[PDB]
UniProtKB/Swiss-Prot annotation:
Gene name of the record: pelA
Entry protein name: Pectate lyase A
Recorded catalytic activity of this chain's protein: Eliminative cleavage of (1->4)-alpha-D-galacturonan to give oligosaccharides with 4-deoxy-alpha-D-galact-4-enuronosyl groups at their non-reducing ends
Subcellular location: Secreted
EC number: 4.2.2.2
GO CC term, one of those recorded: extracellular region
Similarity field: Belongs to the polysaccharide lyase 1 family. PLADES subfamily.
Intrachain S-S bonds: 298-326
Record's keyword annotation contains Acetylation: no
Swiss-Prot/TrEMBL GO biological process terms: pectin catabolic process
Active-site residues per Swiss-Prot or TrEMBL entry: 241
Pathway: Glycan metabolism; pectin degradation; 2-dehydro-3-deoxy-D-gluconate from pectin: step 2/5
Top-level taxon of origin: Bacteria
Length: 361
């Protein structure tokens, strides 16, 4: 097929981990026969089967991963909804309505997957039709919007939007006196994955959001990996976990967080969650949390089994913050790439808001 989106040939920016120890170029080097334009699930997987071949897959309209047939059970959903992205792929949205629904975009590096670029597309979080019951922990949903696992590396998420969509948590029903939880995390990055850059993206309206380093026992595999750079993104109405990281080395700068500690549906808990052996370097970020007094600024960065967190020139409700008294060790590791962290202002944050997410490339 032909190439419509001209920016489809782009590679991740010099800035970020996805450009360290190798470049992320997706299917740029795709041959004309590896340049598709899918409009439905059949075509989508049909193209994706080019496997490790350089490919440019253009999304036109909404792709209903369910193919119109709702999932009968867990098996069914597992079987059909987990769409895999093969190495050297560039999934780019066309125009403003590039959307995916009833599924999960999986970047599983078990078969060597690497060098992926999901760009300019909306992914509405999937609804698990058969949540497991962890007695004492109640109902638990299974699928995310996008999962990067099993060593996957050199992935670039840009102008992507992950949201709950037409089905938000306040629409949950209740099964056996418990709340039928049908949403898992929005974006996951686990089991050895590395070199990831998320930019100009929007995660809006969701509970458990981004979990990096799924388990704090997996250490050995996760140790010294999971380098994620997040900049110019917007986390709006997300309950917890901008990055909630174990082992990882998160670089979140010039991002826009906006929520409300008393929201009716997604109550702000924190943004950065420093987990076991995790480290986060926050800079020039904008934290606009309704109902959050400056005298409680440390609510934005919560501890777990970690401590390495450093922030620079970020703001809470339009004014400089000081997380220094929150009790964290300094981020001593170096950032290999060169970068310009712009001084966060109302203009900037306002600007970042306008250009974050799909349909705005």
């Amino acid at each position: 097929a032909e190439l419509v989106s001209d920016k489809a040939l782009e590679s991740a920016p010099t800035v970020g981990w996805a450009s360290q120890n190798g470049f992320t170029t997706g299917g740029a080097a795709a041959t004309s026969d590896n340049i598709y334009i899918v409009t439905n699930i059949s075509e989508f997987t049909s193209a994706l089967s080019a496997g490790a071949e350089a490919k440019i897959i253009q999304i036109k309209g909404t792709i209903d991963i369910s193919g119109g047939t709702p999932y009968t059970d867990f098996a069914d959903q597992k079987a059909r909804s987990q769409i895999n992205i093969p190495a050297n792929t560039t999934v780019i949205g066309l125009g403003t309505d590039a959307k995916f629904i009833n599924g999960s975009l999986i970047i599983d590096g078990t078969d060597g997957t690497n060098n992926v670029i999901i760009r300019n597309v909306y992914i509405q979080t999937p609804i698990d039709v058969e949540p497991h019951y962890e007695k004492g922990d109640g109902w638990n949903a299974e699928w995310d919007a996008m999962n990067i696992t099993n060593g996957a590396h050199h992935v670039w998420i840009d102008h992507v939007t992950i949201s709950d969509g037409n089905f938000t948590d306040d629409m949950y029903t209740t099964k056996d006196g418990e709340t039928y939880v049908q949403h898992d995390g929005a974006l996951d990055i686990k089991r050895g994955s590395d070199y990831v850059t998320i930019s100009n993206s929007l995660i809006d309206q969701h509970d458990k959001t981004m979990l990096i380093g799924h388990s704090d026992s997996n250490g050995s595999q996760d140790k010294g990996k999971l380098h994620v750079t997040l900049f110019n993104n917007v986390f709006n109405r997300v309950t917890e976990r901008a990055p909630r990281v174990r082992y990882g080395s998160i670089h979140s700068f010039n991002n826009v967080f906006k929520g409300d500690a008393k929201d009716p549906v997604y109550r702000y808990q924190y943004s950065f969650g420093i987990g076991t052996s995790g480290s986060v370097l926050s800079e020039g970020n904008s934290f606009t949390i309704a109902n959050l007094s400056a005298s409680k600024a440390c609510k934005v960065v919560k501890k777990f089994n970690g401590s390495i967190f450093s922030d620079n020139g970020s703001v809470l409700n339009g004014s400089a913050v000081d997380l220094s008294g929150c009790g964290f060790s300094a981020y001593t590791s170096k950032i290999p790439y060169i970068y310009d962290v712009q001084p966060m202002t109302t203009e900037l944050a306002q600007s970042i808001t306008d250009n974050a997410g799909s349909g705005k490339l």
